[PDB]
Amino acid sequence: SWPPSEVLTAVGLICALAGGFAKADIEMAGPMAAVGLLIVSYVVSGKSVDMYIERAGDITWEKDAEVTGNSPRLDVALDESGDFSLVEEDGPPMREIILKVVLMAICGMNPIAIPFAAGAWYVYVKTGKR
Numbered sequence: 001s002w003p004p005s006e007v008l009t010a011v012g013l014i015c016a017l018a019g020g021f022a023k024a025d026i027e028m029a030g031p032m033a034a035v036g037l038l039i040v041s042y043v044v045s046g047k048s049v050d051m052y053i054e055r056a057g058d059i060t061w062e063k064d065a066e067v068t069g070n071s072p073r074l075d076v077a078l079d080e081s082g083d084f085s086l087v088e089e090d091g092p093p094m095r096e097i098i099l100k101v102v103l104m105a106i107c108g109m110n111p112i113a114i115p116f117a118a119g120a121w122y123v124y125v126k127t128g129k130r
Contacts, residue, residue, distance in 0.1 A: 001071035005127070006049070009074050012124030013044050019116030020044075036110025040117040043104050047124065049074070063089045076128035088130050098125045 020040030024033040045051065049072075056072040065086055066072060076086045083089075091097075101121045107114040 001073050003073075003075040005075040008127050009047075009049075009124065009129055012120055012127065013047060016040055016044050016117040016120035016124065019120055020113050022110070022113040022116050024110060024113050032109045033113065036106075036113040039105045039109060040113060043101055043117070043121070047101070047129075052129075061088050061090065063087070074127075074129060084128070087128060091130065094125075094130070097130055098122070101125065 017040060020037045023029060024037040029037075052074070053072045056066045059066045061067055063084075073086055076084075078084050098121075101124075102118045105114045105117065
């Protein structure tokens, strides 16, 4: 149950992780920069496939196809019916979810790596995956 759409979610998260290393973990990094990396890793990890699988295990959302006992899916899409497949229609606003991903991070720790990851995160969410 892992359509090619996985690549879009992979690249997004990977790009964020790459940004996480910006002026960090380079043997010249400060403690703060190291934290910057860890912050990015944390936020990215929360959106990993593994975490999505765990989410599916505890799925409660009636609108989410996974609730029917289907294998975890990434391929968010809008159907002809108007139904948003694998989207929490009854969940928090997408805007708040997108912001949350970024807001969880602290730019003060690494004014480079963090906002770089934020860029990648803004791209990631374009998949519609929450």
